[PDB]
Amino acid sequence: LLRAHVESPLGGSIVLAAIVLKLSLYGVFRLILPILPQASLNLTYIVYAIGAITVLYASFSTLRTVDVKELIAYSSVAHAAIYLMGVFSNTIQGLEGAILLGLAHGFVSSGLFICAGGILYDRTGTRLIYFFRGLTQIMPLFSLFFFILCLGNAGTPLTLNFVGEFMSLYGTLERLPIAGMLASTSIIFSAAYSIYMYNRIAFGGSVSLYFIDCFRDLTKREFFILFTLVSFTVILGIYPSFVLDGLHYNISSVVYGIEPNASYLT
Amino acid sequence: MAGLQHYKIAMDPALVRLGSMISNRYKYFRWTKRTALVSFMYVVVVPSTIGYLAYKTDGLWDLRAKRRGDLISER
Amino acid sequence: KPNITGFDMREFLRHTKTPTYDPWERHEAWRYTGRFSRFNRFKGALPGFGIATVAFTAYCV
Amino acid sequence: MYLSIIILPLLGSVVSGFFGRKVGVSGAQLITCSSVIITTILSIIAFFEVGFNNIPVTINIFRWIDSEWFIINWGFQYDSLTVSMLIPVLIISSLVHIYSISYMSSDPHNQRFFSYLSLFTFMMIILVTANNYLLMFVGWEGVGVCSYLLVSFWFTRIAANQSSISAFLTNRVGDCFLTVGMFAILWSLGNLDYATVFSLAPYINSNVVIIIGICLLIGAMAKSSQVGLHVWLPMAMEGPTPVSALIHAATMVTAGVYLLMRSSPLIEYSSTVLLLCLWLGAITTVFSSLIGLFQQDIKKVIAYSTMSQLGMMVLSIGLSSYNIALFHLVNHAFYKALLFLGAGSVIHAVADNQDFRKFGGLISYLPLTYSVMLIASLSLVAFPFMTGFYSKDFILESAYGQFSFSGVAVYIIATIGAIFTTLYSVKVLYLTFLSNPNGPRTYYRLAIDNFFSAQAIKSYKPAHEGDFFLTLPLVILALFSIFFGFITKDIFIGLGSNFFVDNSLFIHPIHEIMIDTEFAVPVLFKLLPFIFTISFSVIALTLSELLSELVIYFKFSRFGYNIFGFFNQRFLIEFFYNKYITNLILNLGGQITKILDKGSIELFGPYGLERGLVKLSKNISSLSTSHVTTYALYILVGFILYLIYNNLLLDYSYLLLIIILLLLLMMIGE
Amino acid sequence: EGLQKVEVYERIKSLLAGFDKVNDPNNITETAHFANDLGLDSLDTVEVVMAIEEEFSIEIPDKDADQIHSVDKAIEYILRQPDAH
Amino acid sequence: PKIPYPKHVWSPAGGWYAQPANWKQNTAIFGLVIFGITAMVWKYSAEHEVRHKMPEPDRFYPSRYWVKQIKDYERAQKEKQ
Amino acid sequence: SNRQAALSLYRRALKLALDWTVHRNLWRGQALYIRSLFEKNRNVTDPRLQRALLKETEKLLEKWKHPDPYCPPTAPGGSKYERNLPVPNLEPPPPLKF
Amino acid sequence: NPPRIKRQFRDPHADWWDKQERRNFGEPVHEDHDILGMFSPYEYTWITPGKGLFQIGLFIASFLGLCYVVKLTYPDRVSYPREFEGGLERELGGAGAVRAFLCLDDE
Numbered sequence A: 001l002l003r004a005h006v007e008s009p010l011g012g013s014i015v016l017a018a019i020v021l022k023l024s025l026y027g028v029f030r031l032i033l034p035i036l037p038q039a040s041l042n043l044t045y046i047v048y049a050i051g052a053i054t055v056l057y058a059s060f061s062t063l064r065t066v067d068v069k070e071l072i073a074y075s076s077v078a079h080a081a082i083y084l085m086g087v088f089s090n091t092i093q094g095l096e097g098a099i100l101l102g103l104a105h106g107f108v109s110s111g112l113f114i115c116a117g118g119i120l121y122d123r124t125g126t127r128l129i130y131f132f133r134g135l136t137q138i139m140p141l142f143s144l145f146f147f148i149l150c151l152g153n154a155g156t157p158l159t160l161n162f163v164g165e166f167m168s169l170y171g172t173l174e175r176l177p178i179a180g181m182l183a184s185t186s187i188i189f190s191a192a193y194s195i196y197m198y199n200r201i202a203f204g205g206s207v208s209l210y211f212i213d214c215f216r217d218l219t220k221r222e223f224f225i226l227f228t229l230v231s232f233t234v235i236l237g238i239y240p241s242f243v244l245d246g247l248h249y250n251i252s253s254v255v256y257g258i259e260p261n262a263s264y265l266t
Numbered sequence B: 001m002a003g004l005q006h007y008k009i010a011m012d013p014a015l016v017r018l019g020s021m022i023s024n025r026y027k028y029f030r031w032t033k034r035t036a037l038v039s040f041m042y043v044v045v046v047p048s049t050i051g052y053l054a055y056k057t058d059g060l061w062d063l064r065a066k067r068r069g070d071l072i073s074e075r
Numbered sequence C: 001k002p003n004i005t006g007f008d009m010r011e012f013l014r015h016t017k018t019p020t021y022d023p024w025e026r027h028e029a030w031r032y033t034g035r036f037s038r039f040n041r042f043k044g045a046l047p048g049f050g051i052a053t054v055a056f057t058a059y060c061v
Numbered sequence D: 001m002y003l004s005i006i007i008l009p010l011l012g013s014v015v016s017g018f019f020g021r022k023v024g025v026s027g028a029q030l031i032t033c034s035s036v037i038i039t040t041i042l043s044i045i046a047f048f049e050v051g052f053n054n055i056p057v058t059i060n061i062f063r064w065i066d067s068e069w070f071i072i073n074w075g076f077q078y079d080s081l082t083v084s085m086l087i088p089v090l091i092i093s094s095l096v097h098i099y100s101i102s103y104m105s106s107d108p109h110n111q112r113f114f115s116y117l118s119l120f121t122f123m124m125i126i127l128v129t130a131n132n133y134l135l136m137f138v139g140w141e142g143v144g145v146c147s148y149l150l151v152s153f154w155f156t157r158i159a160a161n162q163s164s165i166s167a168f169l170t171n172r173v174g175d176c177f178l179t180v181g182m183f184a185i186l187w188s189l190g191n192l193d194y195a196t197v198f199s200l201a202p203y204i205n206s207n208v209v210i211i212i213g214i215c216l217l218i219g220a221m222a223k224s225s226q227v228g229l230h231v232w233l234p235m236a237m238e239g240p241t242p243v244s245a246l247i248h249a250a251t252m253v254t255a256g257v258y259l260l261m262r263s264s265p266l267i268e269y270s271s272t273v274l275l276l277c278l279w280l281g282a283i284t285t286v287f288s289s290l291i292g293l294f295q296q297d298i299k300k301v302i303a304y305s306t307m308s309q310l311g312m313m314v315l316s317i318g319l320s321s322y323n324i325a326l327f328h329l330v331n332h333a334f335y336k337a338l339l340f341l342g343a344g345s346v347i348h349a350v351a352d353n354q355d356f357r358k359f360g361g362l363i364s365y366l367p368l369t370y371s372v373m374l375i376a377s378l379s380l381v382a383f384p385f386m387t388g389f390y391s392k393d394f395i396l397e398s399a400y401g402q403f404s405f406s407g408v409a410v411y412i413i414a415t416i417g418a419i420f421t422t423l424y425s426v427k428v429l430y431l432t433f434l435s436n437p438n439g440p441r442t443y444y445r446l447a448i449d450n451f452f453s454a455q456a457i458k459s460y461k462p463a464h465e466g467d468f469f470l471t472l473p474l475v476i477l478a479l480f481s482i483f484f485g486f487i488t489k490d491i492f493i494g495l496g497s498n499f500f501v502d503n504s505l506f507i508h509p510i511h512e513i514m515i516d517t518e519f520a521v522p523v524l525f526k527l528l529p530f531i532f533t534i535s536f537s538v539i540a541l542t543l544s545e546l547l548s549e550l551v552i553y554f555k556f557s558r559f560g561y562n563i564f565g566f567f568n569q570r571f572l573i574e575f576f577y578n579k580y581i582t583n584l585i586l587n588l589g590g591q592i593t594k595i596l597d598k599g600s601i602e603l604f605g606p607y608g609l610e611r612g613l614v615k616l617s618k619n620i621s622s623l624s625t626s627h628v629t630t631y632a633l634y635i636l637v638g639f640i641l642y643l644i645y646n647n648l649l650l651d652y653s654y655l656l657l658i659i660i661l662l663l664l665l666m667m668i669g670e
Numbered sequence E: 001e002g003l004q005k006v007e008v009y010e011r012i013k014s015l016l017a018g019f020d021k022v023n024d025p026n027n028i029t030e031t032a033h034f035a036n037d038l039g040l041d042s043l044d045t046v047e048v049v050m051a052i053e054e055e056f057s058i059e060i061p062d063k064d065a066d067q068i069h070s071v072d073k074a075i076e077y078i079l080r081q082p083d084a085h
Numbered sequence F: 001p002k003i004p005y006p007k008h009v010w011s012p013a014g015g016w017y018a019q020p021a022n023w024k025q026n027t028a029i030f031g032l033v034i035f036g037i038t039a040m041v042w043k044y045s046a047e048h049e050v051r052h053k054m055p056e057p058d059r060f061y062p063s064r065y066w067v068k069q070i071k072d073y074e075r076a077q078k079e080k081q
Numbered sequence G: 001s002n003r004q005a006a007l008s009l010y011r012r013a014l015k016l017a018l019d020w021t022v023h024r025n026l027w028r029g030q031a032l033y034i035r036s037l038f039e040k041n042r043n044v045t046d047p048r049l050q051r052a053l054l055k056e057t058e059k060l061l062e063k064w065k066h067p068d069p070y071c072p073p074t075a076p077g078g079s080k081y082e083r084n085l086p087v088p089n090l091e092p093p094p095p096l097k098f
Numbered sequence H: 001n002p003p004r005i006k007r008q009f010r011d012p013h014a015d016w017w018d019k020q021e022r023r024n025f026g027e028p029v030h031e032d033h034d035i036l037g038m039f040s041p042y043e044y045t046w047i048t049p050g051k052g053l054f055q056i057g058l059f060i061a062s063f064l065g066l067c068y069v070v071k072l073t074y075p076d077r078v079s080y081p082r083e084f085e086g087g088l089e090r091e092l093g094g095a096g097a098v099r100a101f102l103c104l105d106d107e
């Protein structure tokens, strides 16, 4: 992923991170939950150790990644760890939160790949972070959408990313508390690499002295693909019922377990 | 240089050379006492520790509707 | 033991006072003169105290 | 009206920000200030409807998150605490919008600044009007995002970039603990609306209450800058001055205090969390009071004085005294904002200098600024019958009034903190106004005394006062700093006052101390703060301008030098945090990227396979010499091996071992 | 707009006139010299450079300080620096 | 003085010292829009608020003049004796 | 060398004293004492001892360094430094398609 | 690799190609360049870590000394705990919840 999601053309990257990562998640709801319930419950601690390790290791390496597209690619790894832990929670809110996070990741990673692999890359021909600084001064429209996208990546409330992270994290916590507590540290570290990357590119001084020419701001095309993606994350972050209402009944069918006075009615 | 014409950038050779070293560093990894110890610590020890802790506390606690006169412990 | 340089820490504080003669004396004299004398600086340290005191005395009768 | 309070500051913010080009500078200021002032009037009306008539108002609009047991609505509750919090937040925000019209008149980005000012107000209102924990968390993060934007407002400055990251990340550390506490509430009670949690709190498992209570205490620590998670707030002084008065002194720093008071029906049933609140507040009082005396920047002194007052509130919350915690929060917001705005007047008057070492004089140059700064300072030191007197001093005797060792200990601790509050309060007013001029000619050179000949019409810049928008808020906040505490103590304290009978604040009867505070506290310990205040002020004022060498003798002692440096360097926390936490994380990432992902994982993975298999492929291909006699022997040896394996009934494990051995040999060249 | 030539010279003129180590206040001109025209030793110049930076509220770096051996040189440095107040 | 800046940079918040000649006219429209939305929000609030105690007749409670719950109670309570 | 450094160390000595001594009049007495020390060593000419004389003074300024030395607002490390920095290039971007 | 020096230690007043980063254009960079420039964790140079540990310990030691003095000398409670008829038991939530002091063991 750190190779393919970076070397891909921009349209390839959007498809690869927005839809192709979601295949393994939808695959869990068809291939593990209904037919391997006993193995899934008995092995959740192995799944959770891997998911917990992935959340910390990917977060720390994202903080030290100097290719802008590679940094957005590595944050996908950290977010996918949370939906993977939510999908093995065997709780309604963890399972719905996993689907919610998967969807919210698709809008946010699409927007951040457009910002890096399509706006910065087309203008400079480079993907190295060392050459960017203070872009807000000359590109206010880019910095406005880039910031909102970086809040989505940090799971800021009013994005669908907070709703999915919260529900996924609650289910992971309730299934296995130590794994949820470590996974919760993502609320600190996703903010760290999102805010760090935003500050170094949009803020952090005047416009970079490596730019010989001045840069134009977003073209109408760039504006309206970012605006559309930002629209979906915010509207669904305020009314996530638009997806949850169509999720509740079917997602009930993949839960495994019983209550003592609720089961075996006569 | 990459399809569409981009803006003129003062591409600093030192920074470009640093970027090339990072892309090619995998070609020069070697097993040493230091690298083996670090790799073993990150890949085996820490994950197996979380795995052991997750194993031993699986099913230990439940909070739902626990009142005074009850225990969080289930096991 | 005395240092190679002739700096004594005890003597440094002994010379921490207003000098009898200073080559910059007239350049810095304005910082202590009329507007910035002790009296003028602290004259209005409690702005409305006199007016309040007079009014309070007239109220206490 | 109750919804109109919520949306009006948001509406102005989107016009100021997303249509600044349409309305310009003046249109942006007119719309935002108008939209905040109108909201403030409706807040005053709300305070009468809800608080004085004890009619809480519920409003629910649409559901936010609906999953089985969790139903979180976009819903707002107005109760006595809600309208109590809205009074300082709306009034100070209205006076800071107005003050900014003058203060930032020469800034090139007025529209964006006033949009941020109005967006912060809206997030604060959401935070206190929400009827459930998660909607409050939105305003909790809302104010955090607005704080990050306003600290980094001058974004070409690197140090303001570092400060904005510090505020965003440090608060996110407390956000992580608040999230787990919300998770613990959801896990135990099925959802997080306030009524449900507070109705079930007396019955839930006592260990569960501790987990939730400690979790929401740590979140409160970060937002209210208590000793553990305090470092961001002093660094937040990098923003423009009206931001410090509004966001980091009066309203957002009080969100942690609001969280504990709103959670009082739950945390009352946990003495553990109360005792941790009690000591944490006391530590924060002395910790910051010590540091602030050794600060060279006026905003940094004032920031550490905010941290010491917020500790007093948390201390009060630890004595089950939420009404007195709320009283101090409201009162402090008035006079501490006055100090910040008065400081901003000084910093404007002397061309942006912020160092005490270059002030002096100015007493005749900024008489109005000095007066209100003096009025605010007497409120801060709880001088008798000032506004701050009625809140702080009651907190102290309440600590004694709870006749316990912890209560007595915090009293002594907070008394020493009060001593150093007086010390740095003296330090500010004297070094700015009362001392000799340590700044240059330009600050004090007046046109009355002839100095220039041809450049006489201009070129004087004598460090004068500000304009109407700069000075009107000072006069208003000065009046609140004198009478507001007296006018309102019977509401917040009373003695059997029933202002909070909607259960906004819950005080369990076993936690009552107020009777003993009123009657059992000896008179000596009641007036002890005033004796200390009236004497160390004499001691401080005498040590300067009369002595002035003794402190110097202390400074140039090795003992004093080390003491001065330690407190000036803020207990070395930023040093130790940067060394062993921030740089520790960066080096962990460096190892992971270099030794594992671009290292061992490549060699014990694809890259090692590529190296070895290419070598293996080339060595096997060496056998293909195209010598027909050699292939003939190869067929023959293969024939015999097949004959041996079947004839001797060989163990299959032997055959696999043989194959692995053959790959081993073909691994080795030659 | 910014700083003018008349202002800086007058401010520097009163600065050097207040220094008792100047041989004669009547020797003070726009193109005066510290070493010969005014009679100032190595230490006195470092003290005057400190004074110039204090009056105009600016920091003069060491490399630039060496260049300021004349009243004219000081005025040029002050006019060049936008920050001086 | 005031800082120089590029005139080609378009920013929705205005840019550097932005004030159109028609700023009062534009401010008038937006303020009118703000009033219109606020009034709609006011109408929603006055219909959907919930109380469990009503104010006493002689007390200053201006919401009694627009909130549906209290208006119904006051109208019904006027039918006495 | 060996002259610029000494003159540099003279300014630093006076600045440090004023950093610790905020009162100018008290600092004035301090300032002449420090200068008097420089005069006592003006007649030294041996390079072997000259550079040793400079090494000791630097250590002295390390031993008594202020935790927070004064900086003018516009100086690097000052409060107003880099507050509203202008865009480095004021030319419009060249016509390119993106 | 050059020496791993944080650029905050470079001279601000040097004629830098990039004044903000205190860097000349083509000078060689360390591999940790991303965390060695101006926008990076500030290095505080007031005290070495061991001395700082000592000064922090002294404050804690001095703080604990005050607590011991307080523990030796803090007054006894000067009023009998307030009693409530019925212990407010019903209005505090019944026997399932916590109640008030009522003719209980003395304290």
Ligand SMILES: CCCCCCCCCCC(CCCCCCCCCC)(CO[C@H]1O[C@@H](CO)[C@H](O[C@@H]2O[C@@H](CO)[C@H](O)[C@@H](O)[C@@H]2O)[C@@H](O)[C@@H]1O)CO[C@H]1O[C@@H](CO)[C@H](O[C@@H]2O[C@@H](CO)[C@H](O)[C@@H](O)[C@@H]2O)[C@@H](O)[C@H]1O
Pocket (backbone or CB within 6 Å): A177, B056, B057, B060, B061, B072, B073, B074, D180, D181, D183, D184, D207, D210, D211, D214, D215
């Ligand atoms: C931010 C944290 C702030 C600080 C929190 C402090 C909270 C304090 C509660 C700690 C707690 C809650 C953990 C729930 C976590 C839920 C999810 C996490 C949070 C989600 C948001 C963890 O307690 C667990 O710990 C386990 C080991 O760790 C133990 O299990 C095993 O231990 C080893 C074999 O015994 C094995 O080696 C290990 O393999 C096993 O597993 C058990 O002790 C227990 O299951 C419950 O503690 C409880 O311990 C018991 C024994 O005293 C107490 O009962 C007492 O017994 C009487 C005589 O004994 C006493 O007369 C009486 O007094 C009381 O009846 C309880 O009263 C309570 O105290």
Ligand SMILES: CCCCCCCCCCCCCCCCCC(=O)OC[C@H](COP(=O)([O-])OCC[N+](C)(C)C)OC(=O)CCCCCCCCCCCCCCCCC
Pocket (backbone or CB within 6 Å): A136, A137, A138, A139, A140, A141, A143, A144, A147, A148, A151, A152, A156, A157, A158, A159, A234, D013, D014, D016, D017, D018, D020, D108, D109, D110, D111, D112, D115, D119, D137, D138, D139, D141, D142, D145, D146, D149, F009, F011, F012, F013, F014, F015, F016
């Ligand atoms: C959470 C995702 C987003 C959800 C909210 C979506 C926005 C809702 C409305 C927010 C209030 C209105 C914002 C006005 C925009 C600010 C001014 C502006 O136009 O910037 C352009 C300005 C233009 O500024 P300028 O007008 O001064 O132009 C000259 C300045 N330069 C030199 C830069 C050109 O660009 C910037 O300078 C800053 C770039 C970053 C913009 C910051 C984003 C503002 C919106 C923050 C979203 C708040 C989220 C709330 C937190 C979630 C709650 C948990």
Ligand SMILES: *P(=O)(O)OCC(C)(C)[C@H](O)C(=O)NCCC(=O)NCCSC(=O)CCCCCCCCCCCCC
Pocket (backbone or CB within 6 Å): C005, C006, C007, E041, E042, E043, E044, G002, G003, G006, G007, G009, G013, G016, G017, G034, G037, G038, G041, G042, G043, G044, G050, G053, G054, G055, G057, G060, G061, G064
């Ligand atoms: P002009 O001819 O007046 O000056 C000639 C100079 C002095 C520049 C020549 O450099 C020269 O003739 N001297 C040769 C170089 C030399 O030996 N320098 C001696 C003076 S510098 C030195 O090393 C001694 C400094 C002593 C005074 C400072 C000690 C530290 C005080 C710190 C106090 C800080 C506050 C507590």
